[PDB]
Structures are given as structure tokens and as C-alpha cells.
Amino acid sequence: EADNQIMGPSSYASFVVRGENLVTAVSYGRVMRTFEHFMARIVDSPEKAGSTKSDLPAVAAGVEDQPRVPISAAVIKLGNHAVAVESLQKMYNDTQSPY
């Protein structure tokens, strides 16, 4: 199947320590991942009944915002699933390590 290409993100999703995390880090030795989400859920909109579509921006921490780039690796269609197939043998043959 002549595809041998995928569109992927060019960078990691950044998570950094903000000041609101930092006061909890110094004061109690705890940080919570994306504190702002929890505070917006608790103190701003109290009820906000649990919904998948509402939480879809929350669960992805900027992974969807990344720019795309072409990636070279072949795929096969196992039934309905287009699955990528590759090897990593050459980068270990370069270093004389067991694969």
C-alpha cells in the first residue's frame, strides 16, 4: 500500500511549572498537573456536569495545537486498521549493540 507517510507533531507538548503550582510546591511539596483546570472546575462553574465533549480540550494538553510534519514509514491495512510497520535495527548496528 503506497502510503509510507504519516502527519505527526514536530514538537513535544510543553508542561511547565507556573506560580500557582509553585506556591503549592514550596508550601506543601505537592503539585497538581494543570492546576488551572481544577480551579476552573471547582470555583468558577460549580456544577458543570461531566461531559466528554466538554472535557476534550482539557484532556489534551496542547498536543492538538502542534503543527504537523510528514513522517516516513510504511503502513498496512489489517482489516480496518491502518498500522505502521518498521524496524530499528540499523541505528543499533551502528553502535555494535544487540538488537
Partner: protein, 49 residues
């Protein structure tokens, strides 16, 4: 093949290399002559070799 040589050279690995020398020597020499008996395997065997 780096699979056989990944652990460096040792007595057992050298011996298995000699055994596979013997195997491939008996089996895949004069491959084009053995292509006659295969019949329907005309192209794919020569391409693989």
C-alpha cells in the same frame, strides 16, 4: 548479518558460523542451475538471491 556477531566472537559463535558455512555451501551454491528444477519459481528466487 549483525544478529550472529552482536555478542562479539566466541567459541560457540565461531562454531555456529562454521556450521552455517557448511549448510549454505551445500544448499545455495549453483542456484541458477537449481532454478531449472523449481519450475514456477523462475523470477522470485533469482531476485531474492
Amino acid at each position: 548479518d549483525p544478529t550472529f556477531t552482536e555478542r562479539g566472537f566466541s567459541k560457540t559463535v565461531k562454531s555456529d558460523l562454521i556450521a552455517m558455512f557448511k549448510r549454505h555451501l551445500l544448499e545455495h551454491s549453483f542456484f541458477l542451475d537449481r532454478a531449472e528444477n523449481m519450475g514456477s519459481g523462475f523470477s522470485q528466487y533469482v531476485r531474492s538471491r
